[PDB]
Ligand SMILES: Nc1nc2c(ncn2[C@@H]2O[C@H](COP(=O)(O)OP(=O)(O)OP(=O)(O)OC[C@H]3O[C@@H](n4cnc5c(N)ncnc54)[C@H](O)[C@@H]3O)[C@@H](O)[C@H]2O)c(=O)[nH]1
Ligand SMILES: Nc1ncnc2c1ncn2[C@@H]1O[C@H](CSCC[C@H](N)C(=O)O)[C@@H](O)[C@H]1O
């Protein structure tokens with residue numbers, strides 16, 4: 001009856017409906033990008049000092065003049081489409097933490113969280129980059 | 134500024150969600166962390182370590198072109214192409230009543246099949262660490278017409294069960310009929326929403342251990358499967374669906390449906406709601422006359438029915454001519470010239486309502502109604518061969534299909550009629566004994582005029598080439614055992630044969646005189 005509080009904007013409607021249904025949400029998304037379709041927008045974006053660690057998973061926003069900062073769970077595909085999480089049981093990486101992304105790569109934050117993984121050494125992005133290896 | 138879905142609208146009664154992390158979308162983060170159209174982390178106002186927020190699954194809106202991925206809504210045309218892949222689907226539901234409000238849960242699901250599955254209200258709930266698929270409070274809708282819903286709140290069943298029961302009830306109904314599914318629905322929105330529970334989507338996949346494309350998916354272990362060869366499979370892999378109302382009807386479903394079909398009375402139950410959707414689907418499609426450009430591949434033995442059919446026709450229309458010696462034969466319902474007994478002295482007049490264009494010089498364009506035409510063909514004999522109608526005229530030779538029988542060939546229709554698919558699906562009126570009031574039933578017999586040529590058998594009925602003797606005459610003794618087979622078959626195809634009453638097996642022997 002609405003009668004309720006609105007979470008989402010229309011420009012993400014089709015994109016979300018897709019991956020909600022898909023057996024493999026990850027693929028479905030990357031493909032939607034292939035098909036020339038728009039990336040998920042509306043993520044929570046952080047107003048920041050921009051001085052801090054470059055690390056990707058942090059308990060308060062930490063950015064670089066290179067990075068921009070995001071409330072983690074808006075950058076989570078599984079969190080955003082409200083479907084089960086790829087970790088077997090049951091839990092998220094990015095809910096309750098802040099996530100960092102290079103400003104150039106920042107256009108598609110939802111994707112960037114899928115595409116890449118965090119070095120357990122320096123707790124920082126692999127390749128975007130990392131001192132290890 | 135600005136517009137919103139709400140798809141995934143937050144249905145919780147909490148004022149002030151949501152910390153900027155553990156907030157799905159910028160849109161919902163408390164006003165408190167928002168500034169200049171941004172968000173900022175204030176350690177002072179903490180994230181809640183416990184909360185439960187119902188996320189609405191309504192408003193799904195899926196139209197997207199992704200190369201490896203199939204359009205799941207199909208054209209009326211492409212929909213006809215697969216008929217009875219068809220299933221009616223309408224979900225009745227319940228609203229979230231206590232810890233939250235503003236969304237619709239799937240209470241009871243129903244089908245073109247008689248089946249009604251009821252589920253316990255369940256929904257998608259956001260917590261700190263995840264989303265969680267879980268039971269929920271609910272109440273039945275306000276209307277007095279919705280009062281029949283109240284008890285079903287208790288009735289059952291867990292969704293883990295229901296999506297399994299669904300796939301079987303579907304699996305065995307569609308196994309021999311088709312390679313895919315199409316859901317046929319009147320108001321498509323809520324049912325699409327209901328679909329989220331049982332339906333996973335993806336690019337076309339070939340079933341494990343089989344040739345045919347995949348209907349089902351099982352999460353128990355990642356696999357794909359097949360209409361026949363699934364079991365204990367919880368999800369449907371790539372359903373298709375057609376919204377009938379999208380064809381631009383005027384009123385509510387029952388309004389239009391009832392215009393045509395009087396056989397379905399409504400009890401507001403989901404099934405009955407989903408049956409009336411197939412009717413309209415079928416009527417608005419197949420009671421228009423017999424489009425011949427549409428080819429439905431056969432499984433199976435349509436051919437052995439097809440041959441055995443012509444065979445029996447020729448036999449009786451040849452005999453009937455010999456017996457009573459009709460000057461003219463009126464063939465009603467012959468699109469193409471096609472004399473059934475190609476050689477007969479008789480004037481062969483053709484009549485049809487939709488005569489094929491070439492060969493239209495041979496045919497009168499006519500629609501037969503016993504009211505109008507009981508007079509109009511007196512002289513000679515009339516042939517209605519699978520031309521189904523207003524009750525048949527006194528002098529006639531007719532084959533009508535009996536709708537009541539079921540085979541994978543024939544499907545339900547409106548109203549009480551059956552849509553029959555051999556090739557070029559043939560919708561036929563429901564079987565009415567009043568149609569045959571003027572005729573009588575056709576007893577089995579054989580006739581062959583020929584020279585005669587493993588174990589022999591005597592038959593009280595075959596006017597036979599040679600009856601002086603037993604007389605099992607090895608050439609007809611074979612042919613008669615073969616034409617009785619193909620006759621026993623078309624009878625079990627459901628068909629019936631009806632002849633003018635005057636007809637007598639006897640008069641066929643006088644053609645043996647000389
Ligand atoms: N319940 C209904 N069943 C029907 C109807 N029309 C056909 N049928 C049945 O479905 C089948 C469809 O007939 P189809 O046209 O697809 O079969 P054929 O491929 O063998 O026909 P043709 O090869 O195109 O040529 C047949 C010619 O033979 C004659 N003919 C036409 N129909 C028949 C039949 N049913 N039995 C015997 N002889 C028939 C007529 O002159 C035809 O022009 C057939 O087996 C019938 O049992 C129908 O209106 N209702
Ligand atoms: N009430 C009616 N009056 C005249 N023709 C009719 C009719 N109902 C159906 N028909 C025609 O009969 C045909 C049905 S197909 C029946 C096939 C025919 N006996 C054959 O030998 O193949 C169609 O062309 C349809 O146009």
Ligand SMILES: [Mg+2]
Nearest residue numbers: 223224320323
């Ligand atoms: Mg509906």
Ligand SMILES: [Zn+2]
Nearest residue numbers: 076078079092
């Ligand atoms: Zn998540």
Ligand SMILES: [Zn+2]
Nearest residue numbers: 119122130132
């Ligand atoms: Zn490192």
Ligand SMILES: [Zn+2]
Nearest residue numbers: 394397412547
């Ligand atoms: Zn009906």
